[PDB]
Design an enzyme around this catalytic site. Structure first.
Site, PDB file in Angstrom:
ATOM      1  N   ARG A 196       0.809  -1.216   0.000  1.00 43.42           N
ATOM      2  CA  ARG A 196       0.000   0.000   0.000  1.00 43.42           C
ATOM      3  C   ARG A 196       0.828   1.244   0.000  1.00 43.42           C
ATOM      4  NH1 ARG A 196      -4.485  -2.999   2.966  1.00 43.42           N
ATOM      5  NH2 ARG A 196      -2.857  -2.484   4.491  1.00 43.42           N
ATOM      6  N   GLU A 208       1.762  -9.830  14.854  1.00 47.67           N
ATOM      7  CA  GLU A 208       0.935 -10.329  16.003  1.00 47.67           C
ATOM      8  C   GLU A 208       1.593 -11.655  16.462  1.00 47.67           C
TER       9      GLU A 208
END
Ligand SMILES: Nc1ncnc2[nH]cnc12
Ligand SMILES: Nc1ncnc2[nH]cnc12
Ligand SMILES: [Cl-]
Ligand SMILES: [Cl-]
Ligand SMILES: [Cl-]
Ligand code: NA
Ligand code: NA
Ligand code: NI
Lengths: 182, 181
Positions: free
Chosen positions: B64, B101
């Site tokens: 992105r 994570e």
């Protein structure tokens, strides 16, 4: 006159890297064009001029190197840019299409809201090799009703068949430069 | 007039409740990309902001970040240099890890693309924890580049990214901000 010089300068600014990703391949490295401001901006100006009177209403680019030329073309043409991505990145409703890799399959997705029946879609990517990812991207667009009969590339490797294979699915392919070999 | 432009930008960004888990208001930059006016406005403000900064290169991480850094590089008239997931860059690279994570991943950059004397702007879509930006900043400074700026479309300040980046000497600029994690 300007434009044939710009094409040559573009082509000169793309480095060839032998034995990447494996031995015998003469890899065409678009990153060297990215870091030359003159070459990069010429590549976008030329693609945008090419499609400025074509009736395009949207650009689609596939992740990741495709973003680098599709999104600036979109910006220069004044139309929306629509990303096609690997699974799990797009947050809204998607449809998906699977495509063959050498060993196994992968998948590309698009947001189902982002293409409509009246859209005239330009697909833009960095490099056309065998055409598999772009053929999957065309299917996604068509499934949603968009017309796609244009796809544009910085680089074409015609010996890998991608141009013939797309051109027989009704896509008119435009590439700024081409190289022989695999 | 100036807040009408930022408001126009901000309103073009969609909010998706409960993606990717409950309680998260997902801020979806893809709706900005499909609004050509919002999208060009966002590139015009980012590039305007750095127009006198002396930047010589823009760095954006995949993927992105490429949607905002490369247009900014084209507007500044300066080179774009990608930072990538491993295994994608053909020339000599160096690598840095950052935290997910679950576990860790790494980013790479071409050693030939940054050199001593370069003034580098990092651009991304969205400042969340800032782990990829910190890694990116280290890649750039290991090659001798100077990086003191990072720019974003969206800031999520409740994730603390600006503070974490101030601590490495980076000034952050974002066009809009949203609450929530
Ligand atoms: N020579 C080459 N360079 C860049 N990408 C490719 N894909 C297939 N062959 C390639
Ligand atoms: N709310 C959010 N929207 C988009 N990206 C994120 N990353 C972490 N939180 C996010
Ligand atoms: Cl890619
Ligand atoms: Cl036709
Ligand atoms: Cl991404
Ligand atoms: Na649709
Ligand atoms: Na270097
Ligand atoms: Ni035709």
């Amino acid at each position: 006159s300007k434009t044939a010089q710009q094409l040559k300068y573009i082509k000169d600014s793309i480095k060839t890297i032998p034995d990447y990703p494996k031995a015998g391949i003469l890899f065409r490295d678009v990153t060297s064009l990215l870091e030359n401001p003159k070459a990069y901006s010429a590549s976008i100006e030329l693609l945008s001029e090419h499609y400025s009177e074509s009736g395009v209403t949207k650009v689609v680019g596939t992740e990741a190197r495709g973003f680098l030329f599709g999104a600036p073309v979109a910006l220069a043409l004044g139309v929306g840019f629509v990303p096609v991505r690997k699974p799990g990145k797009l947050p809204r409703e998607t449809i998906s299409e699977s495509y063959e890799l050498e060993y196994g399959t992968d998948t590309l997705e698009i947001h189902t809201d982002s293409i409509q029946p009246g859209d005239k879609v330009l697909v833009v990517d960095d490099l056309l090799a065998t055409g598999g990812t772009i053929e999957a991207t065309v299917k996604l667009i068509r499934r949603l009703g968009g017309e796609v009969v244009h796809a544009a590339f910085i680089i074409n490797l015609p010996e890998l068949g991608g141009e013939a294979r797309l051109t027989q699915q009704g896509i008119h392919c435009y590439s700024l430069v081409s190289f022989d070999g695999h």
